[PDB]
From a paper:
Interestingly, this disorder of alpha helix 30 did not affect the overall structural integrity of the active site because all the other helices making up the catalytic domain remained intact. In this study, we identified a variant of [name] with a disordered active site alpha helix 30, which is important for PG binding and for the catalytic mechanism of [name].
The active site of [name] is formed by ten alpha helices (α 28, 29, 30, 31, 32, 33, 34, 35, 36, 37), with a six-alphahelix bundle (α 29, 30, 31, 32, 33, 34) constituting the core of the active site that firmly secures the glycan chain.
Author numbering: 41 to 500, 514 to 616
The structure:
Amino acid sequence: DLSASVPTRPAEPERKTLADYGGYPSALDAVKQKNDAAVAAYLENAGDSAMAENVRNEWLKSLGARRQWTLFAQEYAKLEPAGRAQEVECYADSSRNDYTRAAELVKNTGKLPSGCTKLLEQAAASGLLDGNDAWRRVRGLLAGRQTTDARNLAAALGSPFDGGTQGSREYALLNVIGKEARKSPNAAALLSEMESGLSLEQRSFAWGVLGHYQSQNLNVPAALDYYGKVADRRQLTDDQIEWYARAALRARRWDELASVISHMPEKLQKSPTWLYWLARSRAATGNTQEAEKLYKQAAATGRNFYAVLAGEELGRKIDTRNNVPDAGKNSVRRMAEDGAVKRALVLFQNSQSAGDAKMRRQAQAEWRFATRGFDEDKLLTAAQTAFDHGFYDMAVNSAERTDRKLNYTLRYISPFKDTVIRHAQNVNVDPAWVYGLIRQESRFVIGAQSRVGAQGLMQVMDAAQLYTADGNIRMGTWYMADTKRRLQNNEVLATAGYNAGPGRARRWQADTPLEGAVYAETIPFSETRDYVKKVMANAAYYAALFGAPHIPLKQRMGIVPAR
């Protein structure tokens, strides 16, 4: 059952909501201009909104950088803890000389916000960083071309890049681990020579860089050779070790894959991906009981790609029956009366009738803010509220945030159904697949617009039709079908091709057939890799809702042909 409880935060007039949005972009500009007066002014009589919270966060990032600690302390105190930006959090801790966050932040080997980067430097100088993690971050930054951040961190650790000790040596290793040097045919040879004057840690990292590059280029034998020389796998960045795993996966080396996963950070080990592939590994080596236990863990992570695959290895097929009742109409009407939710519905209403894309995005921001910390019943109530106002993406996003209470008709909405079904049938493609793609591409926002310039529901006679929902869907489905036809009629390749181009999709094929999930998990582009898994997962959910003949997701993924 569902609770009818809804929040009752103070509601402002529509005119105030709109008046305050009127000044929102200027407030952000003032932050950028360092006009503290303007900002303070915007905030002093602002609603308790995402608008105020965003301005306050960006302001605090600015204030922290400029070392205006008095004003910082004052405004930081006005933020909701759940609403603080990571970097603002780092600035605040550094101002209190509290380096508690450093133990976890230092495990990140990539670019961090400036406040977070400086917190690690200060912690380093205070002898508060674990030496192993600290130097691993220095290498990661070096290998990721963040040379300045690597410099400063090495300096802060007491061994700068021109000091004759470790720092100078780590810097020196760029002849091997540089972004361009790693691609050299003699990178391996060069490392092999100087290996003698290298620490265990340095050697492991360097071989990881070489194997990572080969692996992400889908040169599997070479990758596994280089990775094979890594003595301490825990020295690897998260991307390096995942690509080690990906190489072992693609080569079907189950014993090595299991071994590699066992050396991952615990948080990586516990992701749906490596829960599943470790279970497959166990299953493939005869350790059934251990496999079954891991499939159970994986299935429990939610509605995602690997959770479904793991469910199928347990004989459990997807079931889209709701395990909760519909939200009651009275609840839904009352949820809309809440001040935070109303402010979101107001900005979203007015962005439609004013055609303001930016106002719509702030309405999304207000929705996230309004529903932050909602229990599952309120989430499900707010999801129907969004749906009723045509705020389709927030309907989906609210509904999918529950863990135990499942409304599949709100998680997998299907507006425009007579239009989508028709266009899909006209070019001979699965409607479930089409809905699956739309849900991922645009979250059913008819006006949706990518940075790359992709347009409409499908993020793609007269050409202008592209911008109407009928024309967009017509073109998207045609291109889905055409791309599929160009890629040996395979739906996994088509999905990758839709996102990255059919040239790339074909380039990622092996010279032997690949299991679909294996092709998908080893896609070199992280955005495309994630896209394919979500689209195909979505599709399996839509097929169930549509009452189509049951097709396991593992079967949907099928076999990707050799090229």
